[PDB]
Design a protein around this ligand. Structure first.
Ligand SMILES: [Mg+2]
Ligand SMILES: [Mg+2]
Lengths: 395, 395
């Protein structure tokens, strides 16, 4: 076959259209170069790029056979000489838009910012209807423009009340294989240290300092010392008590379970306390835990921690350690956190996700999530709600 | 917003259409439930499912605003009350069709067999234009019909001279993370044992037995013994000589390199010889080697191997060992081989790929590849040629 022909079928979807076209094409010397077919809301598009004999293409028979067969059953067809890209290039990036709701104005603002920077939209699809509306756009970004893109979509995100994430869509960068979660107000509801403090009747003081520290207004280590000192004199039994009171973030189990299906190494990195966390890590079958450790004398807390202290730099160090042991390059790691002491860890990771985060963190994170559902992380990792439900139904 | 409306835009693709529609929708109380957009060969389809106030939907203004805006620039739009699936379900399987060429008759036969078994085609796209034409169909298979489907497509594949593979498209099953290759006539061109035999002037005898063994006509262990005996009296220097003569299969480096990008554990399992293979495994930075071992006395081959012998069952055992060490469940493993002694290994693996294989193997493999390009394996693993070239250009 010495000449290229492009055949494009559109119209209202009907069964048997696909088979019919290639059966027709088989009466002409047709060999296939590319086929693309989708149906959206009962609208068929079928594009077929072929090679056929010059003799066949320069004759009305191929045309008449195709036009007759397709028009008969009620669709439209176009036929033209090509001689035209065979296969489209991969998208460079993907954009996730999550919201509850996603207004038309929000999405319209995303599409406008995209167009402004010369970014072509290659595909749009929904990735979730629950617990949040989620939409994916795969895009092609002009080289060097993707900084400008992230800045623009960040402005759009704050103004229009949706989450917007722009991620690299290349082969390696999207083979993410390792994830770490902060514990307090990320994997687990609330702040453990405040739960401990309440037992000393110091919930007020400690909560104040915690929120100061999580906004980046206080050095993490000094804030840890001031807060843990509050616990001086509590019996160590308080540790088990609080451990048994802990509630997982909504969507946490689904998140971990789905990540296990995908072969992720999973771990936690916390400035909190190991005796409280390790019990839970075991229950969640995690692969790695880094945390601080309470000092205990004669079955009583002293109000100090045992060095060395996992601080902001310590969390990045822990992630790096974990990924080295697991044999996972940093570019294929994910970190999820909510607070300013997570800043270094999020920056070290391939993908840093700020989850219901203080401004300090959301300001430097690759992506931010604002809804109280930890499983929206999965959407950022290329999973759809449909795929989660299917896998869970298969059990 | 208390009522659902579906808006469907089709026609010749133009810039700014997407932004325009949602800007229009924003003048009505519209919140988004699902957006699907593709462009194929300059044909746009944009389907938008929304919720809006009952008051707005029961009035001509929304309609007129949308119809005017879209028809003006030269596309078509439909608007209708929904009240309709929000997000489509995931496909159950994916079908790969590879050929050189892929005739219209071949693909037509695939589409017909698919339709016959009540299988719906959800998507078609090209995955490669080189070294082979490759097409992907994502499908939804009626429960219990996928055995019948594989049988039908196997008949089609032999008759029409294309490779056809049907794979499960679920979340876990497609997070493949570990792969093993047979060496001889899979990763490496030709048969090492025949190269060794030629040094003894026994290439003829050994080749005969090798091809008998690879077709499953001979017990592998006895055939190994008869063939290695042929080497009795060769100096062990022959091992290095043959090791330096080895040529990788076309596409081997691309295959391994791409699998490394994706975070695969990679290994080889062979009935061949460790002193010949380990040198190469090191060069290819593989994670695991299992092989047999030549007996050497006083720097001379004795013509025997040192037990235990990696036989047909041994290869499955090796794969299982490798996956256990790597922490990879069998369902997420891949095995590639060409011969009958690979039968147990292919059956144990999540995905068993027969590569230019003897009938005995191709008969029980999940998928078969008939072209002399090892990188066509990558297509079966969900990678496109475009993505390989992009990653390689990024270096
Ligand atoms: Mg926290
Ligand atoms: Mg072999």
């Amino acid at each position: 076959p010495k000449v290229s022909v492009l055949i494009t079928v559109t119209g209202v979807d009907q069964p048997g259209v696909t088979a019919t076209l290639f059966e027709v094409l088989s009466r002409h010397g047709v060999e296939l170069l590319n086929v693309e077919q989708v149906v959206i809301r009962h609208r068929l598009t079928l594009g077929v790029l072929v090679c056929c004999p010059a003799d066949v293409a320069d004759g009305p028979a191929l045309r008449h056979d195709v036009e007759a067969a397709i028009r008969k059953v009620g669709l439209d067809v176009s036929i033209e000489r090509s001689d035209v890209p065979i296969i489209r290039e991969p998208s460079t990036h993907t954009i996730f838009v999550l919201g509850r709701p996603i207004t038309a104005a929000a999405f319209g603002a995303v599409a406008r910012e995209v167009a402004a920077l010369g970014v072509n939209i290659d595909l749009i699809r929904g990735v979730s209807d629950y617990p949040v509306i989620g939409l994916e756009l795969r895009v092609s970004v002009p080289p060097g423009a993707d900084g400008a893109l992230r800045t623009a979509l960040n402005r759009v995100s704050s103004e229009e009340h949706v989450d917007v994430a722009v991620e690299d869509y290349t082969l390696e960068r999207r083979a993410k294989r390792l994830i770490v979660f902060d514990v307090d107000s990320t994997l687990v509801q609330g702040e453990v240290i405040e739960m401990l403090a309440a037992k000393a009747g110091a919930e007020g003081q400690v909560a104040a300092i915690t929120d100061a520290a999580m906004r980046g207004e206080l050095d993490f280590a000094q804030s840890l010392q001031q807060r843990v000192a509050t616990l001086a004199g509590l019996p160590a039994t308080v540790i088990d008590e609080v451990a048994g009171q802990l509630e997982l973030m909504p969507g946490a189990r689904t998140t971990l379970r789905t990540l296990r299906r995908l072969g992720y190494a999973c771990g936690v990195v916390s400035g909190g306390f190991r005796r409280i966390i390790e019990p839970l890590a075991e229950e969640l079958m995690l692969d790695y835990v880094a945390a601080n450790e309470l000092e205990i004398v004669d079955g009583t807390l002293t109000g100090r921690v045992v060095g060395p202290i996992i601080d902001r730099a310590g969390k990045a160090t822990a992630l790096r350690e974990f990924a080295q042991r697991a044999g996972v390059p940093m570019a294929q790691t994910v970190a999820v956190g909510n607070g300013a002491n997570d800043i270094d860890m999020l920056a070290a990771a391939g993908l840093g996700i700020a989850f219901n985060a203080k401004p300090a963190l959301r300001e430097v994170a690759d992506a931010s999530l604002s809804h109280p559902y930890l499983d929206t992380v999965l959407f950022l990792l290329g999973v759809t709600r449909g795929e989660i439900e299917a896998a869970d139904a298969i059990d």
